[PDB]
Nucleic acid binder design. Sequence first.
DNA 1: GTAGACCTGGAC
DNA 2: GTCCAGGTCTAC
Length: 273
Amino acid sequence: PQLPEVETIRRTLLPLIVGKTIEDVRIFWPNIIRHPRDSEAFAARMIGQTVRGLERRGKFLKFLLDRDALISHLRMEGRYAVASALEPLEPHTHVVFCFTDGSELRYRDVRKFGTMHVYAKEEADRRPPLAELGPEPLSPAFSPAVLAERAVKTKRSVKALLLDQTVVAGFGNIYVDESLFRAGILPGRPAASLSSKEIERLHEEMVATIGEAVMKGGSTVRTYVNTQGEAGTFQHHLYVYGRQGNPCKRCGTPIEKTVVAGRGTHYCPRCQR
DNA sequence: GTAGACCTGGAC
DNA sequence: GTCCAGGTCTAC
Ligand SMILES: [Zn+2]
């Protein structure tokens, strides 16, 4: 889940939990709990607190309780769902928050990569993992200038740059490949080689892509669904991600896949230079 | 930068 | 069996 997916989950989850008071927190895979490290402290501190809100920062969900904020990262397979505490759990459910009304928030994560951090609301933003995150793409804080500042200072690929949550928060493998395609820039070239024109163009495609993806409820390419278990539809608007071997939508040249910054990378060798 | 981690299930 | 994954983190 990247920004669009996490945002869609946020919108569809919030009304299902706002106003509910945590009665118990059960953890079946402690490793998911990063702070406090002692999972029993993590569980105990939240009991009695009420969910007042649900925000998003980058790819992180931010549950606003009374005193604390629960920072949750879905990683590759983390998913949430709300259901009756009287029904048997689904497979790979590693954390469950039980509310006083009998309903519960269930966190499922097949690969167990997701993480959870709990801090007082005031400390959450000045501690990891939120501390060093870059600006929000759909906000004025993210501009061509900010991209240039970081671009014209490193030799690494422009793709590694865009995947760096400290540069800008929210872009992942899918949206980085789509933005570079739409901006007509090869993923493997040095971020420092990008001209002011390309940077301005990339920034514009980044904002447009992430914005459109949000509207379409995110991209369901493998296992992503919103809190209602519903799939997004932006996958129908992908130009290159997962389309290796298929003809480019703009020029018909077969889309190609390689490895860039240690990750599957999709691009059109004609459209992107 | 870039394998190796961390983990599990799904295509071929 | 072998490869792959909407994500970082880390060790050579
Ligand atoms: Zn093309």
